[PDB]
Amino acid sequence: SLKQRLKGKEGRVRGNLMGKRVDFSARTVITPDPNLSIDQVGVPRSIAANMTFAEIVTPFNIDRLQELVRRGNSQYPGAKYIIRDNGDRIDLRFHPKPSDLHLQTGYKVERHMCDGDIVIFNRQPTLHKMSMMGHRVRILPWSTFRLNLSVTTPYNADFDGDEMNLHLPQSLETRAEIQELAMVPRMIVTPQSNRPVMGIVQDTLTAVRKFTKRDVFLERGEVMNLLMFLSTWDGKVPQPAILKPRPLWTGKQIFSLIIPGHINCIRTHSTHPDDEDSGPYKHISPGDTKVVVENGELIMGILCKKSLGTSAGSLVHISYLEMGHDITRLFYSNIQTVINNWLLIEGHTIGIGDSIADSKTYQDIQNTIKKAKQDVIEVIEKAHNNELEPTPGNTLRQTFENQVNRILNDARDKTGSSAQKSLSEYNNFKSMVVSGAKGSKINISQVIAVVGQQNVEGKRIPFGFKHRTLPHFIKDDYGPESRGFVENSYLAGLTPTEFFFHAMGGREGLIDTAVKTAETGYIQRRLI
Amino acid sequence: KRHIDQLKEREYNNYSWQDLVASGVVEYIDTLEEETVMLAMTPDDLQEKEVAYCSTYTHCEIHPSMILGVCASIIPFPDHNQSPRNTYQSAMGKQAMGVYITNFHVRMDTLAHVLYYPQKPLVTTRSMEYLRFRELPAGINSIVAIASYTGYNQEDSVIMNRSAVDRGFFRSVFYRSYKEQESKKGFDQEEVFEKPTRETCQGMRHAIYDKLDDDGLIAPGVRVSGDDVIIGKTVTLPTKRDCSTFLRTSETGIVDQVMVTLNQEGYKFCKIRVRSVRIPQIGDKFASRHGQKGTCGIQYRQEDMPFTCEGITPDIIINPHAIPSRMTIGHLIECLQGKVSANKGEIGDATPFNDAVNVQKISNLLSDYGYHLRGNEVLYNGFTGRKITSQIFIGPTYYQRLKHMVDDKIHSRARGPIQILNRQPMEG
């Protein structure tokens, strides 16, 4: 009916007027490109050949445009159409049209998209305005859009099959509006939380943490190679930190050349002892924690997500607020390039040896689990003998569940702490967690020590069968194993019942995500 | 022992599962009966006398690993992975490229992908034998280094060896089949397969009609680029209208088979199959058997890839940052077990709940073959030759090529076709 034509999503009002399918748009898969700048995007030649930008023929660009017209649609840097003053569109694709190849001022040459064009880049859903940003085109081989990795976080994009939409402005006026209101360097700091939207991420973050340790010393050739990838370099090699016996620069000394202008910042590393600030060695910091950037020089410290990440007061945020957006763009790009080449030198990996802990650590974890299981047995015996008394506001069932959960969680935390004590400096799980690039201490603990309690709907694994969780367990068993506690780590491998309970927990998480999307989308539409 | 010995001689002993059921050894139990039955996961661990948990077991599981399905049964060491990752691997293994059937040549199916050189996994679950994964495998074992090399493996992407790709690694064939039926609707209006004529047929296109044979159907073995005319069909106009089928844009294939038959109605019916050989590009999607996928970030040649002392260069480099948050430790255990199996010559056992295959035992086995216990290896940087300071985890892991390829997804629009009702750009 006429009402159905106009009514809902896919109706005229919403599906054709508020939003609509548009021309000069391209969608393809995205792949990483560390070498591209923040604002630069990588465009395949085919996509750039199909999409066009009309350029008015002027006396100063008539020669270049006539060359482009001569090349035509076939040769890539060419023109698909020529729009006359009357509005007649001569077609350069179909037949030479030798008389109509002539250009005069006022004609519009629909040239192919070239390097330096401004294009809007979008990922769905566009939750915030940083999801649509203006990028400068660079044409690269192969068929994927290629974007800098610092720009992945605003788009919420990972290169695992994601695709990104690309919209090309078709007028100089709208091109300027896009360039000024929406360029990626102008989008660094969000108005939502007055923090930078973008920061150093993934490999660059871990390699920065490793690079800015006190231990890192770079010889002459490595210093020159790294200074090659610093675009803002003044061409002057800093005097090395250690002149004799052999000239050796420091990772901090080279990173000081990355930091632009004269930026002042004080942060603290993630593994900063709380005792250090109160006691002596405030400004010496035995662990090289803390971070002090004076006059744009890294005097002391190890950088992590707290210094180079998306947080208020970070080195990135201070750079944006002090030196401006263009210099901050250069800052991001230089960090990524020189630190990625140093990572080529030092290297990074993850293996089984990271998951393995000391034999003493495993023994301590086992002892903690035994003690916890015995304490849960004791609590169950107290409840069975009716010694247990209800906590105020809770039933006897609820207070028993809370006590058992507390015991199990405390044991899980103690095993996790033992596993984390076991971690060496060389451990790479610890490297990624300390840098903040990926992972958490919870993940390390589950990998090495104990997967933990599997809980569905905020309670231990329910009695799905008649008064028992699985047919293998006896009826009325409230012990840790029966109700879902997984004592084995991922490296050790879950036992079959633990495997099923873990599957129950993961299923709950997946259901939560899938149900969440739609409700949040409705709320967002209503607010807007 | 009598039953097991008779089943071991199964053929030429006429003893089968039904005889096992008839003897009363095994029994079928449904969920309602599962509610009233005491089960033991394993006979030795549970039935045998110990600190008595239960002394009234009425049944025993044949093997715990059977709780998994067909797609989850291919996952090696599934108990060492996070639970959502096994769901992801089930979904992705439904999308892997392999030899789907042996009669694929006879079948003319639209959108058929078949891999050049499928391989059976070096680390395999026993239940795979009953899934026929050895007979019709999907994926290739590949030397994989878990390293941060040039930043092109960051996020979830994967660096690949271009030389290996050039040697047949993950090369596939995509068959697209087109069907066209000549039919008569009006008594004077009929559709005929013929090579369209510029003058005789009113509707025509720039697309070359020369490749069409006399019957109006392209012969097999002819290269057909995008928008060329596969089938030439003309309709009498009560001079003629061109209803000829064209290739899907950017198909760029070679005709494989052209079959001409009569359908149920008796009208002439033609099926034409086009081969497009797809080599891995830097947009294609590859996934391990542990629920972590990724597009090819870049391809480096064998000279550029990091190399071990033995001269081995990884076929695939995956970012280490994938492992920690996902906690897919089964991936690392599979790499270690694959290294051990490849040096030993056996096929590794990754059944979910073996309890006889620890990680420490695999490490001790790998030590005997001259490698580091934990599978790390001193890698030399390909570009400069200098040893990489951090020793890098290398091993043979099984990887699958998912059907999602960049060539099918790349699209661009510029003043193209427009819908009739909305007069807005079309969809798709």
Binding site: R412, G505 | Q82
Partner: peptide, 8 residues
């Protein structure tokens, strides 16, 4: 999958 206070 961790605990009651964590995640499932």
């Amino acid at each position: 999958i961790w605990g009651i206070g964590c995640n499932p």
